[PDB]
Amino acid sequence: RGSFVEMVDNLRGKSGQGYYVEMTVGSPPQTLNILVDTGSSNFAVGAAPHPFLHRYYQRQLSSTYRDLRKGVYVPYTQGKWEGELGTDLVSIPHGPNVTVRANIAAITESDKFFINGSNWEGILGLAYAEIARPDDSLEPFFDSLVKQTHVPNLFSLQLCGAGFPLNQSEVLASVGGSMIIGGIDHSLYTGSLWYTPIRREWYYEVIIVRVEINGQDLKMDCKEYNYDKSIVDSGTTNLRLPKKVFEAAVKSIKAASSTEKFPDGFWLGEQLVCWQAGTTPWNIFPVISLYLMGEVTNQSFRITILPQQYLRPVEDSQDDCYKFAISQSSTGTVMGAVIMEGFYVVFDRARKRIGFAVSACHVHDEFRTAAVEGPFVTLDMEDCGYNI
Ligand SMILES: CN1C(=N)N[C@](CCC2CCCCC2)(C[C@H]2CCC[C@@H](NC(=O)c3ccncc3)C2)C1=O
Numbered sequence: 001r002g003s004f005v006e007m008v009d010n011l012r013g014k015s016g017q018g019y020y021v022e023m024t025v026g027s028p029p030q031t032l033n034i035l036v037d038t039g040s041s042n043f044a045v046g047a048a049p050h051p052f053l054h055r056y057y058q059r060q061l062s063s064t065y066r067d068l069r070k071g072v073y074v075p076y077t078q079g080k081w082e083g084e085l086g087t088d089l090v091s092i093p094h095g096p097n098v099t100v101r102a103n104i105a106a107i108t109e110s111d112k113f114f115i116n117g118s119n120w121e122g123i124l125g126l127a128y129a130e131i132a133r134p135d136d137s138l139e140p141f142f143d144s145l146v147k148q149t150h151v152p153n154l155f156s157l158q159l160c161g162a163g164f165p166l167n168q169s170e171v172l173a174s175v176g177g178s179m180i181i182g183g184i185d186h187s188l189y190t191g192s193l194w195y196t197p198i199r200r201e202w203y204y205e206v207i208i209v210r211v212e213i214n215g216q217d218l219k220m221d222c223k224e225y226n227y228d229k230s231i232v233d234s235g236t237t238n239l240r241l242p243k244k245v246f247e248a249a250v251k252s253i254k255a256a257s258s259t260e261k262f263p264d265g266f267w268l269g270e271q272l273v274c275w276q277a278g279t280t281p282w283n284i285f286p287v288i289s290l291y292l293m294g295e296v297t298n299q300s301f302r303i304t305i306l307p308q309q310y311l312r313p314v315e316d317s318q319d320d321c322y323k324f325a326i327s328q329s330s331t332g333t334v335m336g337a338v339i340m341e342g343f344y345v346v347f348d349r350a351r352k353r354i355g356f357a358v359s360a361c362h363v364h365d366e367f368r369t370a371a372v373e374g375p376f377v378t379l380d381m382e383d384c385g386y387n388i
Contacts, residue, residue: 043090
């Protein structure tokens, strides 16, 4: 049974441009589309004209706007966002039937933040206060939601990749998934939910204990897989892996798929690869299994993704084209949107754990499916975690 009908199918978007939910801010309510970001902790919205925005938060039109008289400067690898802090009344129309008083960062300047044609005007940082900007005293949205209402301290995400390119009109008309606030909807997954501990409450940090490519053990010291951390991030497109892990994984993926040669640009995630309509050779590409620490001592489980997850559909012709959605990182593993598209992911903050189950909307073929399986006996899993 699906017990959260009001929130099912409340997301739109895609892996490369982000998945967003409708929200309202202020009095009278101002409707805005907001990217769901499990990799950050600020509710930050466009609040001034920008070439990529067709609407923005107008503080002067909200009777409930409260100015905190404080600026916030947020540089990150790709760019930055800057703004002015305040609070206002916020609601999620296809969400819990509540209105909360929340912090809002009114974005006034940015670089490589907004995405042209993404249809979103701000981001909802769903991670913990530790990584909120300027500091941990700026209460994140979800913390405000839980404190002010009877909403359970849990949310779950079903990000639905279409498996093919969606043009501008299609991506606006299409259901991109669900964000269930305060619960788990059983219609969004098949099989069982398996839980991994949240190692520390800052990002949604997890511990990977083993990696396989078509069942072949990558055989690295498991600390390498979590160097310097492993996180679950809906605000990142790719599966990102630490340099050494990336080099070993790409070697193994190349070897498994060696019946076809792909240019260096494809493996660097820059160049698309194309096949005649319907002839994508899924079977030559391997499945990838990530083993995660379990809730029981010396127990792990595995999540298995297909090339239908790690090859991202892009438009070129009538050919079926893709980009390789696995890339190198110098800041740890990032389980981005392309990985999350395979699974229904439960962010169980109350029980400091993340659940994974096979998504009812994952893209697959008639011969293979994504999987979530366990248990496996795995020793010294705490040693897989990186310190300092
Ligand atoms: C990974 N990642 C993420 N999950 N959220 C941010 C902020 C991280 C935050 C973590 C805690 C400390 C402070 C920083 C922000 C991201 C939001 C989605 C749109 C993105 N836009 C682009 O990447 C982009 C790139 C190029 N052109 C346009 C847009 C930018 C980020 O870098």
